[PDB]
Amino acid sequence: TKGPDAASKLPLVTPHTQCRLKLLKLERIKDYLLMEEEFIRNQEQMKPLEEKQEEERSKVDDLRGTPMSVGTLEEIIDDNHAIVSTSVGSEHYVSILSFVDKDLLEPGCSVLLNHKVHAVIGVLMDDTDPLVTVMKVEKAPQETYADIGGLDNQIQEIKESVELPLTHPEYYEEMGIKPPKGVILYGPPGTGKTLLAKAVANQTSATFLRVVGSELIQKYLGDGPKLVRELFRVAEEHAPSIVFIDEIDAIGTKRYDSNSGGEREIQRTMLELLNQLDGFDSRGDVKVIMATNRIETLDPALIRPGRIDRKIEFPLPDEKTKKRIFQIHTSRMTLADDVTLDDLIMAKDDLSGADIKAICTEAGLMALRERRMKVTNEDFKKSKENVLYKTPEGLYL
Amino acid sequence: RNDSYTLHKILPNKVDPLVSLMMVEKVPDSTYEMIGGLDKQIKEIKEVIELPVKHPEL
Amino acid sequence: EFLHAQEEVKRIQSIPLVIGQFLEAVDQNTAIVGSTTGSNYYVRILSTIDRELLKPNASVALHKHSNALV
Amino acid sequence: KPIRALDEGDIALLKTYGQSTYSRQIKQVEDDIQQLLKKINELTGIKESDTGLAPPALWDLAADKQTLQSEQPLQVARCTKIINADSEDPKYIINVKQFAKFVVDLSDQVAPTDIEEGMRVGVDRNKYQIHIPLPPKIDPTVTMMQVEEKPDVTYSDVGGCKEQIEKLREVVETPLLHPERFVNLGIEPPKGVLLFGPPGTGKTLCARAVANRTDACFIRVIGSELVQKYVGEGARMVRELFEMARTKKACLIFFDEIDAIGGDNEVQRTMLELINQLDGFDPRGNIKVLMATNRPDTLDPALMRPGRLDRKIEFSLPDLEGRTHIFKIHARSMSVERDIRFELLARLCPNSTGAEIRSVCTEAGMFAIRARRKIATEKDFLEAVNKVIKS
Numbered sequence: 001t002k003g004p005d006a007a008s009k010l011p012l013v014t015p016h017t018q019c020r021l022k023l024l025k026l027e028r029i030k031d032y033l034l035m036e037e038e039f040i041r042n043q044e045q046m047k048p049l050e051e052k053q054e055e056e057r058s059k060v061d062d063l064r065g066t067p068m069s070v071g072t073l074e075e076i077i078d079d080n081h082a083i084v085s086t087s088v089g090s091e092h093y094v095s096i097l098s099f100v101d102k103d104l105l106e107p108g109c110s111v112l113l114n115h116k117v118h119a120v121i122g123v124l125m126d127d128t129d130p131l132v133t134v135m136k137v138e139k140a141p142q143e144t145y146a147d148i149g150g151l152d153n154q155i156q157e158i159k160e161s162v163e164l165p166l167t168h169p170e171y172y173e174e175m176g177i178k179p180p181k182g183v184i185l186y187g188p189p190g191t192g193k194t195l196l197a198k199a200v201a202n203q204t205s206a207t208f209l210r211v212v213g214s215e216l217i218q219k220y221l222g223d224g225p226k227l228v229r230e231l232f233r234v235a236e237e238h239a240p241s242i243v244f245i246d247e248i249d250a251i252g253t254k255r256y257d258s259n260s261g262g263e264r265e266i267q268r269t270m271l272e273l274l275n276q277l278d279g280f281d282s283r284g285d286v287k288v289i290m291a292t293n294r295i296e297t298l299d300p301a302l303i304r305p306g307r308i309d310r311k312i313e314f315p316l317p318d319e320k321t322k323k324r325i326f327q328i329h330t331s332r333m334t335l336a337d338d339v340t341l342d343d344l345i346m347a348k349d350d351l352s353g354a355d356i357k358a359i360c361t362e363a364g365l366m367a368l369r370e371r372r373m374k375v376t377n378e379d380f381k382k383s384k385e386n387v388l389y390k391t392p393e394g395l396y397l
Numbered sequence: 398r399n400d401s402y403t404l405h406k407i408l409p410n411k412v413d414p415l416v417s418l419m420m421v422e423k424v425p426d427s428t429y430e431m432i433g434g435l436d437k438q439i440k441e442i443k444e445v446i447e448l449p450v451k452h453p454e455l
Numbered sequence: 456e457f458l459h460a461q462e463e464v465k466r467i468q469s470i471p472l473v474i475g476q477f478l479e480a481v482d483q484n485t486a487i488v489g490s491t492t493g494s495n496y497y498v499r500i501l502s503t504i505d506r507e508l509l510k511p512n513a514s515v516a517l518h519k520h521s522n523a524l525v
Numbered sequence: 526k527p528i529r530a531l532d533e534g535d536i537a538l539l540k541t542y543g544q545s546t547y548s549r550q551i552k553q554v555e556d557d558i559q560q561l562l563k564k565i566n567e568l569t570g571i572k573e574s575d576t577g578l579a580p581p582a583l584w585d586l587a588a589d590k591q592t593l594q595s596e597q598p599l600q601v602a603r604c605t606k607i608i609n610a611d612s613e614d615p616k617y618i619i620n621v622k623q624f625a626k627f628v629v630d631l632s633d634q635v636a637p638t639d640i641e642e643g644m645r646v647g648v649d650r651n652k653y654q655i656h657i658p659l660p661p662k663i664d665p666t667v668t669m670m671q672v673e674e675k676p677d678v679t680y681s682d683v684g685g686c687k688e689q690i691e692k693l694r695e696v697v698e699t700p701l702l703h704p705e706r707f708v709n710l711g712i713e714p715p716k717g718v719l720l721f722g723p724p725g726t727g728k729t730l731c732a733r734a735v736a737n738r739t740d741a742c743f744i745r746v747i748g749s750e751l752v753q754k755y756v757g758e759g760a761r762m763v764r765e766l767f768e769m770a771r772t773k774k775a776c777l778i779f780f781d782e783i784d785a786i787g788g789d790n791e792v793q794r795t796m797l798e799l800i801n802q803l804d805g806f807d808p809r810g811n812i813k814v815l816m817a818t819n820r821p822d823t824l825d826p827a828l829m830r831p832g833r834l835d836r837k838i839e840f841s842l843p844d845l846e847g848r849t850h851i852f853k854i855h856a857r858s859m860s861v862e863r864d865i866r867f868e869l870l871a872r873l874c875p876n877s878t879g880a881e882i883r884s885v886c887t888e889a890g891m892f893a894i895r896a897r898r899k900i901a902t903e904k905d906f907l908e909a910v911n912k913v914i915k916s
């Protein structure tokens with residue numbers, strides 16, 4: 001199989017104060033970008049290479065004709081005929097022409113067929129329908145483990161699950177334990193689940209496949225399980241890989257006796273996902289990461305220990321994690337010296353990481369309200385209740 | 398093409414009609430001058446709607 | 456000859472016609488129509504049609520054998 | 526206080542004054558950086574997708590044209606009722622997938638004896654005549670089937686099911702390895718058994734272990750497999766599995782997670798095919814059926830009728846001795862010390878299913894790796910059982 005993907009550019013942020021150290025670094029980046037551009041431009045400027053075989057290729061193309069419809073090789077018969085299902089779904093007993101690589105024909109591979117008199121005339125190993133292609137990460141997110149405040153145990157567990165096996169896994173079979181196939185993140189909303197997924201996708205060395213969960217569902221019958229199958233086939237094909245299925249409760253809810261055809265198809269899509277998750281060995285280098293807020297509403301077969309062993313809890317940030325988050329999100333700010341930031345952290349609330357980020361943004365807005373950018377403590381004081389909208393006093397005192 | 402299936406033109410990007418109808422082609426006739434009170438609400442809505450769009454530099 | 460050509464153009468608006476939805480306009484004379492037969496086609500708009508009434512998702516009748524937005 | 530909207534002068538002054546002297550070049554350079562990335566992405570190309578072209582000199586392009594002009598494709602279909610042919614009604618209703626269904630007569634090259642209901646048949650375009658029967662074939666690479674002749678799990682690898690494994694012994698060992706006792710006792714050997722219990726209890730694993738120790742090959746039939754894509758012909762698929770079990774000296778046919786099948790049009794066709802392959806097949810055979818479900822009552826009432834399923838077997842959660850035994854059997858394959866109080870761990874994980882115990886051992890290994898120690902301690906097991914158990 002081929003290798004992983006998700007190329008990203010340089011972290012930079014070695015300085016962030018625009019003290020020209022950022023300028024030399026971005027200048028080096030842009031200069032090398034110019035070097036790449038000039039090199040490839042001048043390569044395509046002088047690159048004469050074509051024809052060669054030609055007439056043999058010309059006649060094999062003439063045999064192929066135009067257009068050639070791609071189909072899915074469902075089954076093979078004696079090595080001159082096979083069973084191939086067209087993208088409509090109707091399948092035909094067709095002949096396999098001599099010039100096709102009999103080694104490549106394997107149930108599932110996309111096979112080029114003649115438009116008239118269907119016949120296997122070529123094999124496509126890179127069908128990758130646009131949906132699953134989109135679900136693949138190309139430009140890795142800019143967030144990083146430095147951007148995450150707190151969640152030391154969470155970062156540690158997620159790295160033990162989806163970094164340590166891809167890097168040196170000798171400890172795992174040294175101890176005889178299988179690597180954890182699949183991890184699931186859960187907790188209250190805005191606690192750092194999707195942020196941790198971004199961070200993992202940044203410091204990664206494997207194909208990262210971001211999935212919405214609700215994206216897997218498709219209108220046409222059989223498109224859902226087919227999409228799930230293709231997604232995981234791409235994951236194995238580009239192994240090692242990480243499949244991130246955000247908001248798994250979009251499909252992971254309790255299984256119940258389906259009546260409507262749509263509910264039956266949803267159940268079938270989940271059954272296909274679960275069967276696929278069982279399909280690849282835990283020794284295999286494809287790991288899945290699913291996040292959700294309503295953990296209790298999940299199917300207790302999706303979270304079976306034989307399927308998804310790890311379960312990373314994301315509690316509302318504590319006071320020390322709150323202060324780490326505040327340090328992170330006020331780092332770029334030009335805070336005045338009077339701000340303490342400890343009064344907000346003190347206030348016993350349910351401030352999340354997202355809530356802290358919003359408090360900081362609102363404080364900046366309130367500073368802009370007074371035409372300043374130095375952001376005093378009063379701006380944070382008002383911003384706290386500006387963002388935090390909404391026990392009867394002396395009950396529990 | 399008809400049945401030769403030959404790419405012969407490039408068409409604008411696909412937006413399905415159901416969501417293309419969602420664009421506000423014909424602007425509605427309601428001004429801030431017809432909104433009584435809500436001055437604080439209007440400023441708050443503007444600080445999120447137009448201030449980031451008009452000037453993200455701040 | 457002009458009268459004859461106008462007669463031909465008028466006759467191309469005869470019945471039966473398949474209903475479709477005018478998805479988007481491409482050129483002054485071509486458009487993308489989603490035929491009610493469940494397929495989308497890149498077809499040609501008849502010249503005589505008022506362009507201003509050609510709005511997205513407006514139901515349009517297409518020629519049976521050419522799908523042209525008649 | 527009425528807060529003033531920032532004026533154009535105010536915007537202009539905010540953009541300057543309180544700015545670093547390097548805002549301009551930094552922002553410009555980063556913009557050109559992104560633009561150059563986009564240019565490289567747009568012009569780097571795609572590279573030829575490498576269609577499945579065989580190496581030269583392997584091609585018979587002349588004979589390829591001969592086939593393309595003479596040999597014809599055939600649509601395949603799920604054949605149905607024979608219309609009671611009797612050589613005067615050779616027509617059969619055939620179902621070409623999502624396309625329609627047609628009554629069609631045979632080709633002269635085929636005989637009616639080679640055509641029966643339910644099989645895939647290749648039919649021509651012109652007249653839809655069935656031109657050749659196409660058996661769905663049987664291959665361990667395809668489907669998910671027995672894929673096992675001698676499972677690697679013995680009675681040693683199963684613990685905490687002592688009464689359970691003893692009842693299973695009664696079920697399978699006594700008839701298979703001692704037929705003479707039920708011969709001279711004049712009693713039919715048990716015809717069917719249901720191993721019903723909560724998930725992760727070990728049903729699958731106990732079945733596999735008894736298959737290994739009964740000198741018969743284990744059969745793995747995942748239900749969702751034939752509920753999903755491999756549905757329909759699944760009747761003929763299990764037909765062939767049972768037939769090969771006939772050819773095989775002894776098969777231990779167990780249908781994994783039969784909760785997926787027992788709970789129905791092709792599903793009913795399938796379990797009536799097992800009606801033909803247990804009721805129709807002699808009850809004396811060595812290919813005994815093994816039923817195991819997460820939902821016991823889900824099985825159709827016509828299945829457990831006397832003369833189809835003799836016994837029902839309850840896999841309960843392991844006890845204290847059972848939990849320590851599974852802990853030992855799972856830590857044997859692990860790097861630990863020799864003074865691990867497994868009894869302590871078994872006590873600390875009450876009402877815990879076997880899968881929870883294997884996950885506890887895995888987490889103990891994880892904790893050992895966390896400290897970068899090659900040997901897990903009792904402390905690691907304690908914190909692991911604190912983690913997994915108690916949820």
Ligand SMILES: Nc1ncnc2c1ncn2[C@@H]1O[C@H](COP(=O)(O)OP(=O)(O)OP(=O)(O)O)[C@@H](O)[C@H]1O
Nearest residue numbers: 148149150189190191192193194195325353354357
């Ligand atoms: N520990 C943290 N340190 C820094 N920022 C954090 C932290 N936790 C959350 N945040 C901030 O919260 C924002 C939103 O969080 P995120 O998108 O991860 O939500 P989530 O917890 O996955 O929730 P949901 O999936 O329910 O929307 C992030 O952009 C990030 O800036």
Ligand SMILES: Nc1ncnc2c1ncn2[C@@H]1O[C@H](COP(=O)(O)OP(=O)(O)O)[C@@H](O)[C@H]1O
Nearest residue numbers: 682683684685724725726727728729730879880
């Ligand atoms: N009695 C037992 N002895 C040994 N291992 C067991 C026992 N019960 C459960 N297990 C463990 O549980 C895991 C999964 O069990 P499984 O057979 O899949 O459960 P189910 O009966 O629901 O199919 C196996 O890896 C096995 O090690």
Ligand SMILES: [Mg+2]
Nearest residue numbers: 190193194195
């Ligand atoms: Mg989130």
